[PDB]
Amino acid sequence: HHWGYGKHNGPEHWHKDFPIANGERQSPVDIDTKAVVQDPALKPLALVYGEATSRRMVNNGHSFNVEYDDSQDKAVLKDGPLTGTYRLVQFHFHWGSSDDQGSEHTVDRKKYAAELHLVHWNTKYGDFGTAAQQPDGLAVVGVFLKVGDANPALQKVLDALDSIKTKGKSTDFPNFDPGSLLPNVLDYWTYPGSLTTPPLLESVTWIVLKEPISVSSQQMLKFRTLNFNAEGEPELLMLANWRPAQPLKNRQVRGFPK
Numbered sequence: 001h002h003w004g005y006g007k008h009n010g011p012e013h014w015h016k017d018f019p020i021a022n023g024e025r026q027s028p029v030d031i032d033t034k035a036v037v038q039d040p041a042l043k044p045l046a047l048v049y050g051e052a053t054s055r056r057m058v059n060n061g062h063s064f065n066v067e068y069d070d071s072q073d074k075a076v077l078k079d080g081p082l083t084g085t086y087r088l089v090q091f092h093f094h095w096g097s098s099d100d101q102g103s104e105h106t107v108d109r110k111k112y113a114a115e116l117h118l119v120h121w122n123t124k125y126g127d128f129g130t131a132a133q134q135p136d137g138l139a140v141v142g143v144f145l146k147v148g149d150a151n152p153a154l155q156k157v158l159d160a161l162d163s164i165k166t167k168g169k170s171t172d173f174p175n176f177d178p179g180s181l182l183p184n185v186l187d188y189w190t191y192p193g194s195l196t197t198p199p200l201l202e203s204v205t206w207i208v209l210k211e212p213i214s215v216s217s218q219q220m221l222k223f224r225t226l227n228f229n230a231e232g233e234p235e236l237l238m239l240a241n242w243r244p245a246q247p248l249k250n251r252q253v254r255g256f257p258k
């Protein structure tokens with residue numbers, strides 16, 4: 001295992017291990033709001049999260065994931081720019097080493113403190129792995145975290161990080177409503193893109209919410225207490241885990257409702 005966000009395993013080298021890193025539909029991107037297109041085909045997002053079943057929270061050595069039961073249509077994403085039904089499988093975050101950076105997507109070059117990704121897969125394909133390899137296979141909802149007021153829903157997530165300090169550790173994490181980390185308005189930008197970590201597959205319909213959720217500066221310190229390493233290995237603090245904006249190339253960013 002030789003990718004990460006460090007000195008010798010960073011994003012700048014990922015193309016040597018995953019050549020699609022230099023492909024035509026890479027994520028994240030900068031969203032130039034003056035260039036955003038209005039498409040009357042776009043629908044409001046339908047995030048049907050009422051019966052979501054969270055299972056566990058896991059340190060995977062690059063971020064932490066809250067895992068959801070996706071054996072059935074329990075928490076799904078429909079409409080927006082999508083055709084068909086996409087099940088929620090997990091959420092996770094990216095953040096930076098200080099509050100002025102950390103988001104993967106940027107807005108007119110502005111960076112937020114962190115970014116939440118709610119990951120969904122197209123039930124057309126039977127399983128998450130099959131879906132991750134198709135152009136219409138995945139949908140990720142991105143939500144910016146803007147430094148400001150402390151976020152009590154987020155605090156419930158942060159209260160668990162002491163149990164999962166090192167890579168491979170996990171903890172029971174039941175009855176977490178992923179809807180509690182959404183903003184009040186669901187206006188969005190959308191473009192076709194990729195996973196932002198290896199294997200960087202070009203299977204993601206991106207849905208970036210325009211409105212951020214809040215996070216305190218104190219809360220941001222807590223993300224940075226996690227470890228990239230496994231227990232027993234030299235400590236590597238998870239200070240930053242964001243990929244920088246990649247070239248837009250041919251692509252169009254569309255906005256809803258404009």
Ligand SMILES: NS(=O)(=O)c1ccc(C(=O)NCCc2c[nH]cn2)cc1
Binds near residue numbers: 128197198
């Ligand atoms: N940051 S993000 O673009 O939202 C994102 C979302 C999901 C994944 C992911 O699932 N990674 C493992 C893929 C895999 C290995 N084996 C089967 N699937 C990576 C990045």
Ligand SMILES: [Cu+2]
Binds near residue numbers: 009
């Ligand atoms: Cu490498």
Ligand SMILES: [Cu+2]
Binds near residue numbers: 001002004005228
């Ligand atoms: Cu790593």
Ligand SMILES: [Zn+2]
Binds near residue numbers: 092
């Ligand atoms: Zn992500």
